[PDB]
């Protein structure tokens, strides 16, 4: 008398070999594991790199006064970067935002004459912003060029600045951002710091960001009343909306934004240039490191289930632990092999639950069924 | 305040052409985007034509491109639709359109349109 | 080129009534993207709501706007008998600009 654990394939469409949503990338895509506790389950995973998606970019670009020079460079960049990108899509959407900082004290001064022109008088400033949505996105290259030309720099009193706030709402405002169901970029564009989580209780603000939409006239409206971001708050919710973040900041500051970038699966980070020269070459180099790679990420496993990650890769490379999760120098029509090992360990709930296994950027999901037996 | 006075129509020989013009009154005709927007006899809306608030750039569906041309004077307060190699496509009352804002390319106001017939 | 696809063509409803119109679009647009026009017979389109739901002004508080994504909805709350006209919904989103083919509403 012995039971025994089982796998079996109930979906297993091949790779396509056409629209995003009809491309099949991952294949299984749905099987049923029978698991005794004690016993391991294993099946593989492929993967097919397709050829390059559309693409939406959006730039969220830090406007305070030391941004001032570089926004006659990004000022071009609605029509280059979309001639640039020829090779890449010519289904190309290009967006604006911009963000400084909460607008409290002590992150700003609060004086009328301050808060009319935080910059010193010569400079002409206009009032400072957490965050604003200045063009969603859209093909029209040449109407992101008029209206980022028109865009007024400001700034604050301390350094570190609050674009963590805008990149929440960049992730979950999608209705208005216009985030299509393809590859979505989001270029953050620094020169300074960052605030986080804990830093609002010296502007009297304690509570978390509760990762909704407070967006009314393409502005941020309740950066008084919510903390920043958590990095696992940005993390859940970029990863949730299948954001890819291009950190394009300055060689002061790619140290920490380095460190946020492996915090944060599907981001890149490059160092900006002195004028925001290099912006162009930097992004088709981040896209060209975010699309040559693929990392799994699996949904919310009951406890007592174990999973595990193995990855074999182009040129031999082999991958274990959370690194079997991954893998890189992948070009288009490339494929690659994971292989997943899950382990139960109790018979935890009486009927049968479902979790998901999916590639961060993509829609594309692999739903595994779990099935206890006892 | 806001007018917009379409004329210039009337009948035309296929692959013939004609002139329109639209004079602008009651705004500052330079800072806003002007397009060309024309209603056929199955009362369908085709957009036909935008230039930009400085007339740096324009668009155009790519039915219209090399026949129509979208141009503006800054002085006279005027938008022109110039219509080459003309068709029975082309037979729809024609209105001159103003957008408020670039960041959204909502029409707020709409001429009293001028009608095109071709044969 | 982004395709709008506005239903019901054509409907018929009384003083009093609800009208509910949909319009539905190729590829998602931004919420920013979509507006409405409405053209009493005899005139020109005239920008009714703009951004998916702000009222355009001098535009009577019974009409509302909706939706985000692909599916857009017009609604009158109570329809009024000069009502009566055919209603366009319109992506500003990309190049080319399309419009929807209308939904005419008349009356018993």
């Known amino acids: 008398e012995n039971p025994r654990g089982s796998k079996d394939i109930k979906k297993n469409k091949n790779v396509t070999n056409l629209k995003p949503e009809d491309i099949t990338q991952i294949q299984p895509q749905q099987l049923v594991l029978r698991l005794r506790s004690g016993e391991p389950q294993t099946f593989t995973l492929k993967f097919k790199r397709a050829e390059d998606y559309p693409i939406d970019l959006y730039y969220l670009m830090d406007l305070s006064y030391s941004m001032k020079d570089d926004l006659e460079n990004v000022k071009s960049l609605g029509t280059d970067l979309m001639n640039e990108m020829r090779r890449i899509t010519s289904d190309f959407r290009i967006g604006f935002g911009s963000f400084v900082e909460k607008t409290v004290m002590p992150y700003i001064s609060t004086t009328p004459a301050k808060l009319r022109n935080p910059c010193t008088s010569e400079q002409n400033c206009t009032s400072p912003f957490s965050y604003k949505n200045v063009l969603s996105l859209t093909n029209k290259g040449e109407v992101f060029n008029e209206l980022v030309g028109k865009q007024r720099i400001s700034g604050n009193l301390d350094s570190p600045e609050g674009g963590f706030d805008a990149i929440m709402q960049v992730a979950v405002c999608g209705s208005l951002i216009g985030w299509r169901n393809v590859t979505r970029l989001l270029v953050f564009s620094t020169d300074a710091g960052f605030h986080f989580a804990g830093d609002g209780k010296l502007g009297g603000i304690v509570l978390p960001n509760d990762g909704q939409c407070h967006l009314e006239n393409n502005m941020y409206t309740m950066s008084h009343y919510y903390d920043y971001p958590s990095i696992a708050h940005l993390v859940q919710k970029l990863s949730e909306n299948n954001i890819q973040t291009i950190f394009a900041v300055t060689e002061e500051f790619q140290p920490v934004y380095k460190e946020l970038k492996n915090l944060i699966p599907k981001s890149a980070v490059g160092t900006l240039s002195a004028n925001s020269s290099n912006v162009i070459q930097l992004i088709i180099d981040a896209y060209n490191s975010l699309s040559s790679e693929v990392i799994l990420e699996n949904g919310k496993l009951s406890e007592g289930v174990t999973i595990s990650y193995k990855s074999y890769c182009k040129n031999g490379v082999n991958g274990t632990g959370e690194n079997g999760r991954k893998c890189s120098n992948i070009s288009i029509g490339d494929e690659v092999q994971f292989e997943i090992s899950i382990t139960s360990n109790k018979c935890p709930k009486k009927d049968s639950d479902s979790f998901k296994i999916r590639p961060l950027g993509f829609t594309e999901e692999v739903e595994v069924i779990l099935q206890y037996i006892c | 305040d806001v007018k917009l006075v379409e004329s210039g129509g009337g009948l035309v020989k296929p692959g013939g052409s004609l002139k329109l013009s639209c004079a602008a009154s009651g705004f500052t005709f330079s800072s806003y985007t002007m397009s060309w927007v024309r209603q056929t006899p199955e009362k369908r809306l085709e957009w036909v034509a935008t230039?930009?608030?400085?007339?740096?750039?324009?668009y155009y569906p790519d039915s219209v491109k090399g026949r129509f041309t979208i141009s503006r004077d800054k002085a006279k307060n005027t938008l022109y639709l110039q219509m080459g190699s003309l068709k029975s496509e082309d037979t729809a009352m024609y209105y001159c359109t103003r957008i408020g804002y670039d960041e959204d390319y909502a029409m707020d106001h709409w001429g009293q349109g001028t009608s095109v017939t071709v044969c | 080129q982004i395709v709008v696809t506005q239903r019901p063509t054509t409907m018929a409803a009384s003083p009093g009534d609800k009208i509910i119109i949909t319009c539905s679009v190729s590829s998602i647009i931004s919420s920013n993207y979509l507006h409405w026009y409405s053209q009493k017979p005899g005139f020109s389109p005239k920008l009714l709501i703009y951004?998916?739901?702000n009222l355009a002004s001098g535009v009577p508080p019974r009409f509302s706007g909706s939706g985000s994504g692909t599916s857009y909805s017009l609604t009158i709350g109570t329809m009024e008998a000069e009502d009566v006209a055919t209603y366009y919904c319109q992506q500003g989103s990309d190049i080319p600009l399309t419009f929807g083919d209308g939904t005419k509403l008349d009356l018993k």
């Open positions: 951004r998916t739901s």
């Open positions: 230039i930009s608030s400085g007339g740096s750039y324009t």
